Design a protein around this ligand. Structure first.
Ligand SMILES: Cc1cc2nc3c(=O)[nH]c(=O)nc-3n(C[C@H](O)[C@H](O)[C@H](O)COP(=O)(O)O)c2cc1C
Ligand SMILES: Cc1cc2nc3c(=O)[nH]c(=O)nc-3n(C[C@H](O)[C@H](O)[C@H](O)COP(=O)(O)O)c2cc1C
Ligand SMILES: Cc1cc2nc3c(=O)[nH]c(=O)nc-3n(C[C@H](O)[C@H](O)[C@H](O)COP(=O)(O)O)c2cc1C
Ligand SMILES: Cc1cc2nc3c(=O)[nH]c(=O)nc-3n(C[C@H](O)[C@H](O)[C@H](O)COP(=O)(O)O)c2cc1C
Lengths: 141, 140, 137, 138
């Protein structure tokens, strides 16, 4: 059974991580190949580290703060956060986190699903830029 | 360190299913909540069935056949396919399958990951159509 | 030539061009270029000697017509986006700019209006806004 | 009257020029205030020059050549061309030219209509760029 759920995660293209919520600083104890391709970091450089290493220059500190609180309160969270690949390229990370609890209700882990939506959001920005330039002229008219 | 993967799959929004390659006609033995939302079918109405119940008259037979061949040859595949929700609502399904083999190298299951990319397909079509409209404001 | 050249210039404008007589009652159209004929679908016979309001229809924004009328009576220029209708009853968005025409004594004699169908650009916007619905949710 | 057309041309925001097809190098004999505002050149720096002075490094040679042909063949033409204002600021010129013949059928002038369509173009460019992006996704 379990073998097959692992292989399901291994098959997913989105980044999947599991962090240990009973160790200090919620270290990554698993990542899938999709996380390697998404971030540019091999697993050897991922395991045992907090995910915050993905953050960079323009990452929004408010979003990081909202994420921090969710985790410390053992709650799910779904944010869009600016992250950076190992090569320094920025990417927009549609990030979802969910707590894992055992039969006693003890928080043991977090799961995290990371999806690159750079292309999608970049297309919005350009479309909205073209469209704002138009509606501004219709405002004068 | 086994149920943690299950939970990870449970939280995946994209549809995830597992079919049993040993049982006849590859019955679905698992689907996450993501699949229930995608298809409109509660898991109780999904389990035990072949995924072809998502197909309908407008599904491209060439895509289906190509997929059938990959599965009979125990190979991975990736296809864009028209599916139907329980309510008949059509959608574009970005379907990727992967074989699962035990340590003996026997094929025991397929993993299926389905994403509704309807909005993405429409987005391109709409943006292309808009482009033409705007290009029409300038002769040449 | 001299006068005639400018005539061919005005005829070269693909954009609709009308000259209205600002002395005659009801500011009638005295001239319209071929571009205006193509835009509206009205031949020059069915245009010349009519007020341009014949282009307006059920959904035409009364506010826009009001701002447009004000400037005219005040011999001032104006630029508006207005819904008009073609002879075949087809609606179109009219990017309309009008300018007053004064003689050597500075007396308002005519108006000059330039019409451009921007229906395509509006349509494109509609298509983009529709494509953004998905993301916006 | 036909004196109307002239004063009308003087109001239009769009550029209007007349060139003499008989004189050497098709000089501009007339430009409206719109042409002055569009190009940023006072009419004294316009009249008696060929319109090519608006062209610059990024101007497409194929378009220029296509235009040159039509002018020598005494035909109409309609092109979209990159021009430069006096300040060195580029703009997209929708250029519509027509030949003016006399009663003999002899070519005497050209009428030029210049419209700044930069915004329209820049709109198309942003969409094309957005489409590259959204295509990646699929
Ligand atoms: C399962 C999981 C996955 C995470 N994935 C990411 C991620 O991909 N990118 C990111 O910037 N932060 C991610 N985080 C959040 C950070 O690891 C961290 O909790 C956050 O930056 C709080 O900052 P601080 O604790 O250093 O103040 C993830 C957290 C968890 C629990
Ligand atoms: C794991 C897995 C997931 C599948 N998911 C879908 C799906 O979401 N939609 C679909 O139309 N077919 C899906 N299929 C394909 C059908 O189950 C079936 O294999 C296909 O139609 C083969 O052709 P046949 O129906 O003629 O045998 C999936 C197959 C597997 C093994
Ligand atoms: C030069 C000129 C061009 C005009 N072109 C248009 C036009 O293309 N479409 C339109 O609906 N109204 C146009 N108008 C406005 C109408 O002719 C009219 O002045 C306006 O609707 C004023 O309100 P009324 O029609 O109720 O008097 C134009 C006016 C002028 C002076
Ligand atoms: C009426 C008229 C208007 C023109 N307006 C422009 C213009 O606005 N911008 C431009 O770059 N060229 C314009 N041209 C083109 C040039 O004047 C010239 O014909 C062309 O560049 C020929 O190539 P040459 O420069 O190698 O002689 C115009 C030509 C005519 C006849």
């Amino acid at each position: 059974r379990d073998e097959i759920f692992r292989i399901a995660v291994e098959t997913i293209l989105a980044g999947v991580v599991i962090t240990d919520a009973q160790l200090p600083d919620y270290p990554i104890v698993y990542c899938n190949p999709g996380f390697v391709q998404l971030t540019g970091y091999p697993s050897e450089e991922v395991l045992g580290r907090n995910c915050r290493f993905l953050q960079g220059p323009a990452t929004n500190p408010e979003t990081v703060a909202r994420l921090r609180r969710a985790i410390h309160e053992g709650r799910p969270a779904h944010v869009l956060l600016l992250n950076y690949r190992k090569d320094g390229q920025p990417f927009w990370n549609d990030l979802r986190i969910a707590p894992v609890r055992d039969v006693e209700g003890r928080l043991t882990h977090f799961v995290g699903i990371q999806s690159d939506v750079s292309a999608k959001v970049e297309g919005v920005r350009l479309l909205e830029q073209a469209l704002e330039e138009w509606r501004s002229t219709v405002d004068t008219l």
